[PDB]
Design a protein around this nucleic acid. Structure first.
Lengths: 123, 177, 140, 45
RNA sequence: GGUAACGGAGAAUAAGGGUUCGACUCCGGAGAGGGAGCCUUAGAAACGGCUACCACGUCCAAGGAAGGCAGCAGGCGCGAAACUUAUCCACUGUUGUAUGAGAUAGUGACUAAAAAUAUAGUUGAAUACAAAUGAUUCUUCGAGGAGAGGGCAAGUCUGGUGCCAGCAGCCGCGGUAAUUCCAGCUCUCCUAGUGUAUCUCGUUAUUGCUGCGGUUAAAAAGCUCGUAGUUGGAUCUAGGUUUACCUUGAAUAAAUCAGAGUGCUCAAUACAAGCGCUUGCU
RNA sequence: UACCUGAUUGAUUCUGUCAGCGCGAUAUGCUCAAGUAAAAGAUUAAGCCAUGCAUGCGAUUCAUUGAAAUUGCGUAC
């Protein structure tokens, strides 16, 4: 389960680092992203929650695999420049339960028909 | 919105569907190099004919033409790196001498049984299909896969195959259990 | 002989266009009444209803009665005669039946010893006539 | 002569016969190999 | 006057010269059921803005009030002919939470590339994603289409019918001893594809500019004059002002066609990528 | 790959077409182990549409963070 990093760019104006991470697990299945995260954190002597492996696709027959990684200066910048879904995936943030777009669009369409403060009441 | 995806054909059907000479010759070629269908050989014939027609179009021009130089050197280079054209034969006036057998020999399916990795060409094909061959640490399951000169010497058994080192096959596991 | 002057392009082109109309293929494809005269209206297939069934005396020296069916196209209501291929397939065609019909092969010309018949049935009652002959299916 | 009512006469008169069973012929490369090894082809008389 | 006509970039075929097409992802134009008239505005004769008429609908308590999917998804019709009344701004842009633009999944033998039947699936894991499915890793178990007289590759084998049934693009088979039908048995082509129908191009020097033919096969006007058109004799520095034409440059959106490099496993494709070592170079 | 082949005759050579033959478009028959890209109500009816969506977001906050409303902007892309 050797990890290697290439193409490293330090994004101070995004307070992180961007690389390409390659994991070698011949015979074994694809690496768990948590294990990749731990190995990258040990490599870069920084917190394991401030490292983001993503887009990890494996090659045929096991062995080689490639997926990108974002190592962040601080958790503030991590959950400052990032989409919510990644933070939900790794547990940093949480998913917000929201109605489907069909239902929400119907709600707003009916809310259009009604004027004043009854817009909130109608549902 | 979305664009037109770019496609291109590689096989051109013969003008005469039936003639004993071509039929027998192509059957003999299929036998010599294990292929699946006549489209396989027409693909090689049409690649060869593209090569030859481009070379002829080039030779219609004189020797030191910039386009002639670039294209001829590139084409001789590609054929060399595949291992079809001879590396002491550097000219299009000589590339106008090739045959389908040359390209067909540069298929993985041939090299497998050639270098002793399989007994028959059929055995070679079924081994590649079952993922028991590897190339430069790369399990290629494509019999028509094209083996360059460099990769010519970089094929051995798969690092996971029971025959290349790994768990016993299904029959062996059944017997053990 | 044809004109050969360096400034006779108009004459050459006009003469060629004028003489193209004396060509059967060009005239057939550019006449303008093709759609009105052709039962299928330029299509390859059509649908219709059966009216009656006929036997046509095959031309000399052949002796046989070819079993065709008179059909009415749904697109335009025109009456045509369509051939029913394979043996004992007229049985699978009953009066007042929906049929898919196609060309016979010679692009509006009769084929073989069947006189005046230029279409052929490809499906009856939404079934393939070949399937009906081969027993792969049965009359709905 | 022809009467338009004798349809299916020959296939109706045709004596009915059954089929025979044969080992599933080899498919694809095996068929090509078998044909090559076997190499008029159907000289009955 | 006609067009079963939006123009172009282009597409198919293709020695050369061409023939045909181009509703359609880009550019320009037009339209929002058919007309007409306008408000607002920088910009509209706007229609997911209004006003009126015509055609056709919708709700009414009959006093009234409304509608414009040639936007996305679906429905009816028309037909030979064409998909889910799905999820999302996670990606690509719009000034940016909003975006049926846009991006995801569904049906899909349009199609392009790559490939199992000999020597697939399945259980649960690991990956991906806005969520997902399916792809990429481990582990449990665990052959069909046409054909077989010639054109054209491939049977004068067996029984029935006796020009009937049928086959057959064409020539042609079948009339009581059928290599062509109906069966049965056999083989050939191609191959997870292979037939059929209509149409385009080649074949076609059977539209001929290159490049046809006109005594008898189709084709020289009965003959002459004649305007337009077409075509027009030789001749100006060999020696010891205008044009036409040819050469080279300028201005000439991409996508496609031709064309370098690069193992996305190959290829269609795509425009990637490839080395050190971590704070990197090309 | 600058290509032809069958058919008028007792037989022959021509003219000439018909047929065959290769590609492509559309439809359709039979059949189809799994996967990757991927066209897709143009052709006829610019025919008619149930139902859902497709255009909404700085100044003005005594409602409970920001609702409602007025402006501004856009909806001519």
């Amino acid at each position: 389960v050797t990890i290697r990093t290439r193409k490293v760019l330090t994004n101070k104006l995004l307070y992180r680092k961007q690389m390409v991470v390659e994991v070698i697990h011949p015979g074994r299945p694809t690496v768990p992203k948590a294990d990749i995260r731990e190995k990258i954190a040990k490599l870069y002597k920084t917190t394991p929650d401030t490292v983001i492996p993503f887009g990890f696709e494996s090659k045929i027959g096991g062995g080689k695999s490639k997926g990108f990684a974002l190592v962040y200066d601080t958790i503030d910048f991590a959950k400052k420049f990032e989409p919510k879904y990644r933070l939900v995936r790794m547990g940093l943030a949480t998913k917000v339960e929201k109605p489907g777009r069909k239902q929400r669009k119907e709600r707003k369409n009916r809310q259009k028909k009604v004027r004043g403060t009854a817009k909130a009441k109608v549902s | 919105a979305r664009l037109k995806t770019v496609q291109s054909k590689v096989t051109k059907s013969p003008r005469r569907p039936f003639e004993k000479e071509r039929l027998d010759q192509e059957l003999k070629l299929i036998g010599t190099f294990g292929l699946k269908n006549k489209r396989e050989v027409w693909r090689v014939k049409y690649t060869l004919a593209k090569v030859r027609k481009a070379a002829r179009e080039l030779l219609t021009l004189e020797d030191k033409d910039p386009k002639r130089l670039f294209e001829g050197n590139a084409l001789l280079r590609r054929l060399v790196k595949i291992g079809v054209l001879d590396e002491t034969k550097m000219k299009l006036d000589y590339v106008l001498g090739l045959k389908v057998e040359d390209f067909l020999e540069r298929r993985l399916q041939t090299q497998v049984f050639k270098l002793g990795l399989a007994k028959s060409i059929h055995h070679a094909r079924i081994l590649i299909k079952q993922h028991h061959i590897r190339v430069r640490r790369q399990v290629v399951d494509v019999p028509s896969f094209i083996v360059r000169l460099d990769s010519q010497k970089h094929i051995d058994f798969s690092l996971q195959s029971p025959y290349g080192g790994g768990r016993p096959g299904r029959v062996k596991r059944r017997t053990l259990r | 002989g044809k004109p050969k002057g360096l400034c006779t392009a108009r004459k050459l082109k006009t003469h060629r266009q004028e003489q193209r109309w004396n060509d059967k293929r060009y005239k057939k494809a550019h006449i303008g009444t093709r759609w009105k005269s052709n039962p299928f209206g330029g299509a390859s297939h059509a649908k219709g209803i059966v009216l009656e069934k006929i036997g046509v005396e095959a031309k000399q020296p052949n002796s046989a009665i070819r079993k065709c069916v008179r059909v009415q196209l749904i697109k335009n209501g025109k009456k045509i005669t369509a051939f029913v291929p394979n043996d004992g397939c007229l049985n699978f065609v009953e009066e007042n039946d929906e049929v898919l019909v196609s060309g016979f092969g010679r692009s509006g010309h009769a084929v073989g010893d069947i006189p005046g018949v230029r279409f052929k049935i490809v499906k009856v009652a939404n079934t393939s006539l070949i399937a009906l002959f081969k027993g792969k299916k049965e009359r709905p | 002569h022809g009467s338009l009512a004798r349809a299916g006469k020959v296939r109706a008169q045709t004596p009915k016969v059954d089929k025979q069973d044969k080992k599933k012929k080899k498919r694809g490369r095996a068929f090509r190999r078998v044909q090559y090894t076997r190499r008029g082809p159907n000289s009955n008389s």
